Symmetry: C8
Subunit: 234 residues, 8 copies
């Protein structure tokens, strides 16, 4: 997808930013219609994992684990129990630091989702397909927030929407366009990822502008990708 | 392009100074879900009013929202910070100075108190949309209540109510025509509805606060600002 | 609507009354029938929000927030922590009083709800529509109680029933009859709201008669609205 | 208003009114409404407790103490005390606290059974006066009320009432009914629940007379028309 | 009123009424009503404990002690103590507290089975004297009552009852019924109560009589007149076991 | 009464009855009834535990100690002690407390399987001697009973029983049945559960005898008619 | 009884029986039965843990220690201690308490997958010997058994078994079956599947343990036993 | 036969020494269940990913997995042991020497992040499977995410994502022909998909770790290994 390429070729910052990752909540309230199970969610429930990946892939952030904090704490208990008596095989000693802290924490909401099946119309032209074949429209809105831990104020809050027309051309292969491409992943997931990745870039952009963080070369503020995504926020 | 509610909200007259306000949840108190063939669990209304409100309070240029949903998370992070620096070994460039959590005298809270949606044909919609009297458009109505509570006393200072009614139909794949009891939107209508209501509520809120002396304008004359009188009139 | 106009034009009391607002529980047990979701409630779940609005709008009461008492308390902790060390910017100082108390607390129940689709009969006659055209009947019963915090005894206990025949004439506009007028609100919404509004007035009347609270002008005990709602209460 | 209400509100007086604590009346019918109702729609309103509290008051025999929101009460009292302990509160805003009113008996109960069927013609049709094609409704609710001695925990009384109501709609939202003749604007099942609880309160008062828990002001009134009406009902 | 009630209300007297703690009778049938009922509609009423208490009282053998609402009781007693500890309460309003009454036995139970099917013709049609195409109902309930020794935790008594009732509606809200345990005797009764409830109640009332008999036979409690062990009702119910 | 019941109530006597604590028999079939039953109707009764207690009592080999309501018991004993500590209790109402009777063996169990199929013609039709289009049902239950040594926690015995019952209704509420012909007034699936549990208790008794967990009064009677009958069944 | 049970009950003996604490076997298939079953009817019986315990005993290799109901155990022991601490209990009623027996190993597991579909013809029709239009049933279950070292928390052994059973009914409640690599059973097929799988897992476990020196055979020569080598090859 | 992923996983080059890793759950975060006529409660994907991961980590010969799911059970058993020998009376042949629970510097965790399943006919399936264009095969797609966390600092060291797509159809009862974007399988296709994704996940993880200097190979000659290069190309 284009978002992944843009995300992976940003200009570099002075240094990577520590950030603690809390959840991206699904707040659409939406599930699939008949004949799905009543319990089948309309959107994957994996936004947080995607965010962690998107933050790392940006080359701008060091994500700190918080979802499984209790597990972390246990493991550290077990380490301490294994070395407090000074008998542990030295090749097996694990030096413990204090957990890395962060001044900002990142959180989010999937704020909306719409999906409908369509045929012909504008989609059929851009795809180069028959005016009777049925395609899909998937739209997701994501909100990402960065909170200041020192004060509890919101440092940054971007909103992204991605809308994707798609249709199956081969078993398990989809052609799609971002309001032209090939994808092997489900359209709805491509949408969720693309929205989250874009959100991270929006995030990085907003932070540069507000002096939360700066680029290695301030000259690189006018990088093609950065202005591309800066303009997607009007 | 973007709704009238957003435009009005983002061009309000300024307050003497921005007001800190703590935001807790906006509950969906409609009791409503989508009918067959929806999943029984599909909510009629989006479940993200709180995020929308935080964004709208910020966008008004009147408020600095303090997020409280993850207060418990915030507090843990501060524990983790203190534990990392109490021994004075942390790399000086990685030191995180802690202030006190910013406090607020007022707390804003709310409810989505009503929602109705039905599909319609002909009538006023058909005329204003300029469509066939057999062609179907949709009506979405959402009602929101916003309350301001005094943290020092616990008195409920303000309690405003807004209703937004939106007529819509899809004209192109993923594009909707709408009327606010004509515009175009790329967003699903029930969300356009909820957003407009929340944004309107924040404006109603600001007005009520001025009138009750909860907060004051920078320019005392601008009590007769076009936007403020517009929304003042929607409340009578 | 009539209830609202009347509620906002009550004669004034000697002084506004503090009251703690606790929930109005939905005790109908009722949800919407096919094709609604099984989980769709028959009645909105916002009676309490409406009570607070009605109490303030009566200009008789000062409602004290209790649903978010725990949040309140937290904010007060945060306030104290921010100023106990005396370093806070003097203009950023927030003086804390004790939470305002109340001798009475108001609570309630939605004790019954009926909703049915109908044709012909009285509706058709008064609405002036075909005996084949369909209207809705919505009926709600509400109970409001005022409790003495000092003794735990019930100070006042009023009951209201609102019955509304309605039908849609235009997209989103209903003509209704109160067992003719026009409303933009959903009928069940208007029914619940009207019952609660009427309830507060019933409450206020009962309170006057039982000496729980007094009017500035005792002569206005014969106010048009007050006697109107006194007549309904029998 | 129904006969039950009339009777309840015209009982002979007791020596002095009785404090009684009311905790919830549980729906123990296990019953919900059939298709096309939501699976979650209860057959019977979930508001019996509120109704009982009202009925206890209306009888003029009892002063009901509500306990459902006891924890809220307690909080309010915390807030009151915190507000005046430092003696700075304006004397006009001072709230004098008494001790919460206590009671020796606790009343509790269950809705123990419910049946509803749609009927056509038959016997009802005659007292209603219509053809074997019009459909009327039968609603039957059974309630149990218990009185508990708080001092000892003995269950002093356990009465049972059944109300059966035949009804059918004549006008939109207006019902004709017969109590195994009147008109009601209230939904029949709710008229039934209410009539059951009201009747129960009277069964309770009678049973208390008979067990020496309380007696009448005027001993002659021990064989009052209403009290005797409902005693015969209870056997 | 059912025969079970008549019999329960005319048992011979004991030396003294027996204190008993009443805990719940659990519905362990696992059964709900079929389409078109709500999935949540229970096949059997959920009110056996309320009925048990009434049956224990109506027997004139027991004094039931409240335990379902034990926590509420305790609260009320707190409130009481708080109201008179400062010695200012109006003397007419003073409430003397004893210790909660104890009991050496607790009674508990299970509804262990429930069967219901609609039938036509057959033996029912004969004994009811109705058309072989008219529909009647069969309801069967099984109840288990246990008496537990609180001093030792041993189970003192565990009786089992089944009541089977054929019924059909004859008038609006009036049912004619038969008690399969007397089917061939051809006696038919009328009831205003729903059949599954008459069934539940009749089983529970029978269980208590079974219970009183077992206790008599095992010396858990005694009759005033030892001679009255040969009372008609006691041998009637002694034989059903 | 069932063959199982006759056999259980006429076993050879043990040297003396055995105290055993009874904890639950869990329904571990995972099975509920099909359409048009309620989704919530269990396939099998939920009263196996009460049945076991009755069966253990009825064997004349065990004295079951009630543990399901252990917490209630303990409460009752608090209440007794509170009523007598002050030495004021009415002498005829005095309750002497012993210690709760203890037991060295715990009995517990699982219903591990259930099958129900309604059938037509075939072998059933022959043994019943009915029309070959008339429909009968097959019910099969598998039960597991375990005895645990409380001193050590070792599992002393683990027996498994399967009962399969063919039945069809011949009179209203009366069933003819066969255990791979008899009459029962009880529902076939209950007869199935009960019979399995009764057989289980006998199995248990045999295994205990064989392993020296407990002994019979006359050691020669190991060759009792009933004991060998059920011994051969496994 | 099936090939798995005969085999489990005729294994070569170990040096001595092994204590193992049994915690649950979780159903991790996520699977329930389709229409017209109740939505809540599980595809697979929920009794794997009871079955494992039975299998472990039946192997004559293990002594299972009950842990599912450990708190009940603990309560009963409290009651015993309470009954004899005051030295008055009748000596014949005295219960000597040891410490709960411990174990160096802990056995745990998961049912990790399940399939069921109905079929016609193919290998089944041949091994069953019926026409290619007559229908048989396929049930397949995958189980994972783990043995964990309590001293270190490392996983000591981890076997995986899949059993596939083709089946169809010939008489009411009697089935023809095949252990897809012919037999009779009175039990439901998915039952025989789970049980055969759990029994196979225990043998796989015993084998893996011998090979890794977790436990030893009486006679190391018996390493080439017919049953043991049979199960070595299926792994 | 057995999937290529398994074959590749079990023939990796050895690391300098095997690495202890603690494994907590792999959550199903697809939100997906089976459609009618399945039970509403039937999950689309097996709920046994964690067992499968533990199995995969062992099989790679790079890791020693420490299961933590029953940590509480473990701890209880150790209590029981200690209580059983603290009085020094236990039978010597039954004596159990307790070490400390083995610790690990890294902790592995993961999510099933996506799942789609469809029944299909004709197209590529009919061609490669060699079946009638009306004959039905199924498509299963699963996406897995594995994360490695530093237990000493809480930094998330690695987060790899894998997708497996499998076309399949049953050819004989309980035997499937399948294609991994022809082979035969006795196991169910959705399980084959989940297993293959997880195995691939582990190799991706090993690769990422080499790259980030978390670990290196025993034999320097093996730095450019065919299997390691194969699976790097699937990521890029």
């Amino acid at each position: 997808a284009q978002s992944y390429k843009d995300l992976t070729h940003l200009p570099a910052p002075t240094g990577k930013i520590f950030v603690s990752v809390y959840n991206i909540q699904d707040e659409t309230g939406q599930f699939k219609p008949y004949p799905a199970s009543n319990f089948s969610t309309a959107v994957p429930q994996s936004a947080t994992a995607m965010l962690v990946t998107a933050l790392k892939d940006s080359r701008w952030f060091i994500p700190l684990e918080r979802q499984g904090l209790q597990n972390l704490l246990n493991e550290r208990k077990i380490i301490r129990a294994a070395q407090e008596n000074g008998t542990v095989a030295i090749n097996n000693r694990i030096p413990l630091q204090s957990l890395t802290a962060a001044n900002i924490m990142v959180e989010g909401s999937i704020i909306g989702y719409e999906s409908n099946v369509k045929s012909g119309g504008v989609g059929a032209r851009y795809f180069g397909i028959g005016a009777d074949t049925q395609y899909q429209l998937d739209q997701i809105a994501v909100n990402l927030r960065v909170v200041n831990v020192s004060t509890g104020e919101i440092l940054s809050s971007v909103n992204t929407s991605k809308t994707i027309l798609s249709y199956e051309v081969q078993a398990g292969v989809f052609r799609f366009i971002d309001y032209v491409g090939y994808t092997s992943n489900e359209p709805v997931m491509l949408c969720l990822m693309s929205a989250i990745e874009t959100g991270v870039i929006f995030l990085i952009n907003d932070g540069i502008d507000r002096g939360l963080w700066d680029l290695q070369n301030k000259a690189e503020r006018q990088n093609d990708i950065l202005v591309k995504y800066r303009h997607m926020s009007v």
